[PDB]
């Protein structure tokens, strides 16, 4: 079904070694739950158990939301990744555009 | 460490269906932050993610502080609860005496 969690301001590349802020908003009828989470997943991931790293959904919740991924936990390779919001039932409720962890280049 | 947020005038029981005013004061060197909050937690809570309900810390801040919990959001059972002040880093900076939501009784 349609995404119930929308990622905003997602970059196409993030600087290696920097912390990354992930911005998201809940759609009108969506009810977030305390064990929901956001993963960073390699594009083409098969199951939610494959996340590279994750953060639990930011609490408390009443509006812009954000969660911070610390540099230590971010990918070091050149593969493509996305954010995915996974609810307590294991259902993906939102997914972002793909990005890499790399410096800016001329093709950008 | 020692509490940096002190709850005052906390009752041992609050009337079911009434709004509850939570009174607190900041200790001298404490610096409140805009995403700090006060939760109502069941006694014996393990993580700050377990709050029953919450309010963001009252703003603006310059002294007595207070925040109002609306009746709709309060517990309906007979369990024991407390207020806890949680800062932006997830650290508990103050905690109140325990209370229930119930009428006065003879044991009181």
Residue numbers in the entry:
A (entry chain A), B (entry chain A): 19 to 80, 87 to 132
Give the published text:
In this study we discovered that the ubiquitin-binding autophagy receptor NDP52 binds preferentially to LC3C, in contrast to other autophagy adaptors including p62 and NBR1 that nonselectively interact with several human ATG8 orthologs. NDP52 comprises an N-terminal SKICH domain of unknown structure (aa 1–127), a central coiled-coil forming region (aa 140–420) and a C-terminal ubiquitin-binding Zn finger domain (ZnF, aa 421–446).
Since the SKICH domain fold was unknown, experimental phasing was performed exploiting the anomalous scattering of cadmium ions contained in one of two independent crystal forms. The structure revealed a β sandwich fold comprising seven antiparallel β strands, organized in two sheets of four and three strands. Some loops connecting the seven β strands of NDP52 fold back to form hydrophobic interactions with the β sheets. The SKICH domain resembles an Ig-fold lacking the eighth β strand, which places the N and C termini onto opposite sides of the β sandwich. The specificity of NDP52 for LC3C is mediated by a noncanonical LIR comprising the tripeptide Leu-Val-Val, which we refer to as the CLIR motif. This binding site in NDP52, located between the SKICH domain and a coiled-coil forming region, is distinct from a previously predicted LIR within the SKICH domain, i.e., Trp-Ile-Gly-Ile55-58 (Kraft et al., 2010). While this sequence is reminiscent of a LIR motif, our structure reveals it to be buried in a β sandwich-fold and inaccessible for canonical ATG8 interactions.
